Write a protein that binds this ligand. Structure first.
Ligand SMILES: Nc1ncnc2c1ncn2[C@@H]1O[C@H](COP(=O)(O)OP(=O)(O)O)[C@@H](O)[C@H]1O
Ligand SMILES: Nc1ncnc2c1ncn2[C@@H]1O[C@H](COP(=O)(O)OP(=O)(O)O)[C@@H](O)[C@H]1O
Lengths: 419, 426, 419, 426, 87
């Protein structure tokens, strides 16, 4: 079929009228300065003289800068393209730098049209797991449907389960939770009549998805074959002219999304030239970049600057900054990611993970959640305790301990320093 | 190829200089402080005046300008003022040397594109043509028809003998050049094509129209990069459409030049060279400066203004050879170097007021002082950016007039480059 | 049509029999050692065992070494090819290193033949300027002729004006001042009879000009189109064989000219290989090189030598040296370049330019002449005074002041040194 | 392809060694000072003698020579003397390692060209042929005719049966190999072509000519690089004609070798390997020495003599690995290293006298002393150059005999490399 | 395309000159000879011919003689010179 531009966080967590950030509702956690700074940038974008500027989010690793970008993406609205790209992924054998950058940008520009489709609406009954099958009914009929990996993902993302009244677009596979029939959020009543109805609906698809749709479908096991992932220019030219025609006609509307480039210090002068040329088109999305470096080398030259951006670029970008989470914030984040992975922690366990999160970082602390879950399971323990978080901490090292441990083979002292 | 064309200029680049309307000089070439949008910097302005005068005097023989100074100075603004002083609708193409570093285009291929953006074409031709289907052919009286309207003409013998040359009879569709074909109506359903049938001129029997248009060589290029049957995708979604820009070809450019020279020969159009401004000039390499050297020689080439905020730098394309501003000796020799000074706090407060009244955001006298202190601490670039956010933070709690509290929070929400790094370093 | 090999200085300024240099007649100014050294080299070339050697002219910037090369070129005779090439121009996208070097060398090798042509001879009446039209007459008729950029150049180069009896070759555009009808140098009488006569004349054209003539004429705005400037080998082969045939026949004679390569320290090992291979042909011109460096790196290798020449090359070259002009010489040079640009200076003004020339160099001092001229004009001043030379000195900086000024942003002392 | 060919040697390179006529050694292989053009340096000469003897004895199994010493030494001169001692008309190809660095040719493509310059071909065949139109065919008497001249021959039965093989009758144009066709006269205007008609041998009825010629493999290459209908442009204007030299092709070289082997098989020609001398050997890279290693193995290859005035240098093509003279170990192993010494003032004065009497410029005994002191101060190279200018400065005020005043002004008009730099540095 | 001095034609009722050519030009060339040897040409064309006279006249290319009217039938069996396109 196709795929709509819905590919967790609902917003910036900010007062609609004050732009003052409530700490955790949307929910982002902490980073109130950076989130209010984001709200201002958005208000600057929504209408004003921002005029084709990138956004730089600088801060330590495992801050909330990646999440803020999505928080910025949602504030613009659902069905508004949000694509994330690690700057290093631009360098591969699958495709050239120019190609990868084009796909990334075209993934962030959505084409919106009104067309009829077969949408489903009913109350969920059952959902299954494998190494699925959705049972849905109305007041008139019940049905069982089969589905694959891509399908099961979007549903678990939209947080769906038995008792939820949902809406499935058979043409794009877009799931939408309308409400609930009973408790186990909006209390709606079960849909009446036909389970499947043909309705006129708005479809928003990226320029890249359209390119993919009109290309020879990628073969099974594409990754491990030598097959490249570039898109034929003749196909793009075909898609560009038709999208330009639809815009002139009125059939289509262009919806600029958000392109978030992480570890942007990996880009070279040539990459920044492209990003500069792209931002000069009206169709251009909001380019948001994130760096973990204080000062870095400008790749492509022998010049160093803050975050490793060309001095020209830095004069154009809007810089937002993030900071280390407070222990309370870490404790709140890890507790959230624990229930999302379905892990029952002990108050002590969470406390140790928080202390671990301080010492080694949020991502590392997060990794230890699932390993601890399995250790508790091997134990048959009723709940994930501190005894398990400690044992996983001794089994799986973080980067700092790892490099120290490997350096331990060639050591420098017993009574004093030696070399 | 088409004569009338649209032009999509990159106005993102001169958006921070919308107040600069000129250099603001006396009749004697002495700079007036706080005139034409400028504020102080009188030396650089007066210097530009000599450059603008040397250009008009054609005494600028194969030479260029180099603006040396720090970031906060008025380097780009000065260049813009130069193009303005050079006349009306003079092409201005500002770039940075870092732009020419492209993945799918050679460094000089990029420079050449920009040269075309800095070469304008003033077209001031008036075309008067009486057209339509012929109705009479008799002291020579010839008639013509249009959709709604009919004119009977009074011809001299000289034209009816030039009409004897062109395939013309009644009633066909014809064109008349005042200064210097089967009609659609007679077509039968049985003809189809190939056909000799064309529509009657709708809906005027005359056409004394005046052609007034100014465009750059690049506006012509892009206009003819689309075939009949497609839209202007290049200026709609330029870089995003595909990786490599294959639409603008060599053959296409030389066809333009071939056409451009023709309009000039007929005294219809004059091509007016503008101003090509290149920031971060030290980013160019030897092969780039070799191209620029050839450019400086041509009579029909834009004035080349360079800028740099580096005193000494390695000449790119050379074995660690350092020179003034990163410019090679062979090329630096051809430059009049104009130095730009930093600004006094009172000069900075004035500039902020000018910018704010242009945005235009209203702010208190205490706010202006706070914004200018960042114009001293950090560049004039950074502090000027603080206006937008503070205005928003005001309006949100507005209190529409901006205060010090607003600039205070804005300076904490949006750090400058150097701060952001040193804070992250820790 | 075509262009003859006349593309300022009439000689070395040297005693014809002593080789002792009169200081300024030809006129070069000063550099008497270097000019006498040149005269010896020429006498060595004219006949003897010089045997395919390059000439190196080393000395500070803005000396007379460039002018001496032309002074050497004229001593060989008019209609003897002289071409000047900045070593860095060899590196471009328009053409390869091998191509640029071939054109440069072929620009210095002239083909001389006797053929009929339409030459004009008459007394000039008027000359005009634009953003021209030559009126010429004889004792039998008068005529007005139109001309373009290339034409107006050669005339102003030959120093022509109203009252001069000149000669114009309609086939090559070669202007020749025969004399004068009255005063405003040889007092000749006005030409009689037909203004245009067909005569047998010697035409000397470079191998490159012939190549250009037999190639598709460069399109208008060639520079700003992507058009390369190389010459098709099939065209060269055509020109080479015919020139070889003409030489065998006797129709043509090869006239080796002078190739002057400036800032020769920009050439790499490969460039010096070419220059070495070219000098091994009998048709080879006199290669004269000029460097501003004491010691430089041999580009292409990690070896350094005087002037940046391969140690092999240095053992073959004849080295001439120039020195800083004396203040009197500078004053004489600047005064000459002032009248040539048509600038009326004050005795004080010239004095300051000379002091400026000492401090910043001859080229910089020269630049300040035209800027001062315009400042005086804006003033409506009758003559260019010191008040104008001073004001242009404060407006337009030289390289040294410029780098110091830009360095001024990050300064190192107020009470003492800081860093 | 043609047998007889012209050879244009690069005599610019051995112009400074026109006095070197040999090594000047005794019958016992001991060097005589100031003999054969040489002066002192007896050790290197005697060493070369052993090399020349090892070569003639074929004991030089896959080995080469390396001349180690300073600039002023007799390195290139020694190599030239080696080729001379190796026999008559022995090929000598001197080059510098810096030459192989070409823009449009690979480093070894250049070496290979020079190997061909150092491989000679001695052709000593005597061809005797009786040609012309046949007139008689009868103890076998056959007649022949020429432009002016007629001969009646006396043939044996063995030739008239070999003549029975070739298409031969009276009267046709025929060729006769002593040791081992319609005549032009019968052509009618009505025939045209294709034709079988050829001219009668003018203007001799016989041809017992002796072919005596010595040429290098490169002389053959260039000779056949021109087609019939063109001139020898390659040796007229070699590098100047065009950037890339496409005339000499691989197929052309192997056709030469195919022909060269044929002449050898017929005992007509012997190919004589000469001397390939390469200065600045440290300029070669690993890929160059790999080629030279293969060369040293071949029996039909020129003796490879290398020279270097660097004690230790980085092996090019290796990661900053330094070795003796810049030569790799795998190759240095195959070299007999001969050291060249600098010269005493009296040795230098003698050399200058020899050179001056060869130029030949006459100069005083005081002049010789002044020129030799620059042979000590600077190289023997620089001071020897001072002769020409001084001779000119003399002759101009001549006073044709050169004096000290002349060398005095010449040394001030023409500085050496080191002086020119250090003076300019200041 | 007209300027001084080029070779031009004038129709009363209704180009580089050969002189300026250099030996170095060859071709392709824009050079043509000057009209020899009259500066005017008010000539009267008086001729009567059949359609067949025109046919045969154009049956020969520049570089050949009038062989058709010299030895018509004898030159060859089939007369392929006069073609439909030519008529
Ligand atoms: N003398 C001046 N008068 C008024 N505005 C100025 C002056 N100098 C700089 N500005 C403004 O301050 C900002 C500095 O930018 P710009 O001149 O482009 O700096 P750069 O030296 O980096 O090119 C711009 O908004 C510019 O319009
Ligand atoms: N022993 C010698 N006897 C005579 N002439 C010599 C002697 N040694 C060197 N020369 C001459 O001195 C000059 C030095 O050049 P050359 O031998 O090629 O030096 P290099 O060591 O650099 O190869 C040449 O003119 C050479 O003929």
């Amino acid at each position: 079929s196709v795929t709509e531009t819905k590919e967790h966080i609902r917003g910036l967590g900010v007062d609609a009228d004050t732009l003052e950030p409530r700490p955790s509702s949307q929910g982002l956690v902490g980073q109130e300065k950076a989130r209010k700074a984001a709200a201002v940038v958005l208000e600057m974008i929504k209408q004003g003289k921002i005029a084709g500027r990138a956004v730089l989010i600088a801060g330590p690793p495992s801050t909330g800068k990646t999440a803020i970008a999505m928080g910025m993406a949602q504030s613009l609205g659902q069905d508004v393209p949000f694509t994330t790209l690690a700057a290093s992924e631009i360098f591969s054998l699958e495709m050239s730098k120019t190609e990868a950058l084009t796909q990334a940008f075209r993934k962030s520009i959505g084409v919106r049209i009104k067309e009829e489709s077969e949408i489903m609406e009913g109350e969920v009954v059952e959902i299954q797991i494998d190494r699925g099958k959705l049972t849905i009914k109305t007041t008139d009929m019940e049905a069982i449907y089969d589905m694959g990996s891509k399908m099961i993902d979007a549903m678990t993302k939209e947080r769906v389960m038995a008792g939820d009244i949902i809406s499935i677009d058979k043409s794009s596979g877009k799931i939408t939770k309308l409400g609930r029939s009973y408790a186990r959020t909006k209390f709606l009543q079960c849909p009446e009549g036909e389970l499947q109805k043909r309705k006129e609906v708005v479809h928003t698809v990226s320029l890249h998805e359209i390119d993919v749709i009109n290309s020879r479908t990628q073969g099974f096991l594409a990754l491990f074959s030598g097959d490249t992932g570039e898109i034929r220019s003749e196909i793009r030219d075909q898609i560009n002219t038709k999208v330009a025609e639809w815009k002139e006609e009125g059939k289509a509307e262009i919806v600029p999304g958000v392109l978030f480039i992480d570890e942007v210090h990996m880009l070279d002068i040539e990459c920044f030239s492209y990003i500069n040329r792209a931002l000069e088109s009206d169709l251009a999305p909001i380019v948001i970049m994130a760096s973990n470096r204080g000062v870095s080398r400008i790749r492509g030259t022998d010049y160093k600057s803050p975050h490793g951006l060309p001095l020209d670029f830095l004069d154009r970008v809007v810089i937002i900054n993030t900071h280390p989470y407070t222990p309370d914030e870490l404790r709140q984040i890890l507790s959230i990611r624990a229930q999302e992975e379905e892990v029952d922690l002990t108050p002590d366990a969470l406390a140790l993970l928080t202390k671990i999160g301080q010492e080694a970082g949020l991502r590392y602390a997060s990794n230890l959640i699932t390993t601890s879950q399995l250790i508790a399971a091997k134990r048959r323990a009723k709940q994930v305790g501190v005894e398990d978080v400690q044992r996983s901490f001794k089994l799986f090292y973080d980067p700092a301990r790892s490099v120290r441990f490997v350096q331990e083979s060639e050591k420098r002292l017993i009574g004093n320093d030696g070399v | 190829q088409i004569s009338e064309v649209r032009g999509n200029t990159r106005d993102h680049r001169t958006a921070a200089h919308t107040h600069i309307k000129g250099l603001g000089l006396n009749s004697s070439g002495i700079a007036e402080k706080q005139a034409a949008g400028f504020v102080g910097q009188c030396a650089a302005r007066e210097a530009c005046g000599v450059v603008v005068d040397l250009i008009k005097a054609h005494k600028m023989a194969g030479r260029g300008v180099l603006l040396a100074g720090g970031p906060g100075t008025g380097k780009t603004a000065l260049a813009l003022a130069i193009s303005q002083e050079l006349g009306t609708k003079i092409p201005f193409c500002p770039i940075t040397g870092s732009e020419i570093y492209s993945t799918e285009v050679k460094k000089t291929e990029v420079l050449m594109e920009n040269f075309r953006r800095a070469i304008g074409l003033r077209v001031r031709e008036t075309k008067d043509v009486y057209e339509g289907e012929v109705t009479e052919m008799t002291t020579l009286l010839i008639g013509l028809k249009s959709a709604r309207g009919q004119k009977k003409l009074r011809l001299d013998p000289s034209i009816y003998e030039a009409i004897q040359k062109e395939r013309v009879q009644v009633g066909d569709v014809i064109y008349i050049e005042t200064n210097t074909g089967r009609s659609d109506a007679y077509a039968t359903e049985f003809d189809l094509e190939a056909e000799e049938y064309v529509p009657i001129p709708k809906g005027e029997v005359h056409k004394k129209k005046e052609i007034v248009q100014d465009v750059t060589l690049h506006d012509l290029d892009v206009a003819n990069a689309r075939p009949q049957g497609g839209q202007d995708i290049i200026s709609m979604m330029g870089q995003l459409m595909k990786p490599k820009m294959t639409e603008i070809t060599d053959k296409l450019r030389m066809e333009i030049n071939k056409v451009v020279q023709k309009y000039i020969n007929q005294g219809v159009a004059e091509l007016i060279p503008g101003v090509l401004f290149i920031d971060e000039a030290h980013m160019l390499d030897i092969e780039c400066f070799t191209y620029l050297n050839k450019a400086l020689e041509s009579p029909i080439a834009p004035i080349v203004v360079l800028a740099s905020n580096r005193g000494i730098a390695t000449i790119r394309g050379a074995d660690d050879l350092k020179a003034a501003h990163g410019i090679p000796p062979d090329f630096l020799q051809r430059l009049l170097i104009i130095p730009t000074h930093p600004y006094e706090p009172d000069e900075i407060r004035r500039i902020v007021r000018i910018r704010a009244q242009t945005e235009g955001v209203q702010l208190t006298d205490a706010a202006v002082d706070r914004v200018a202190e960042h114009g001293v601490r950090i560049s004039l670039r950074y502090c000027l950016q603080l206006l937008a956010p503070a205005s928003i933070l005001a309006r949100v709690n507005g209190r529409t007039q901006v205060d010090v509290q607003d600039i205070a929070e804005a300076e904490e929400l949006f750090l400058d480059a150097r701060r952001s790094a040193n804070i992250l370093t820790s």
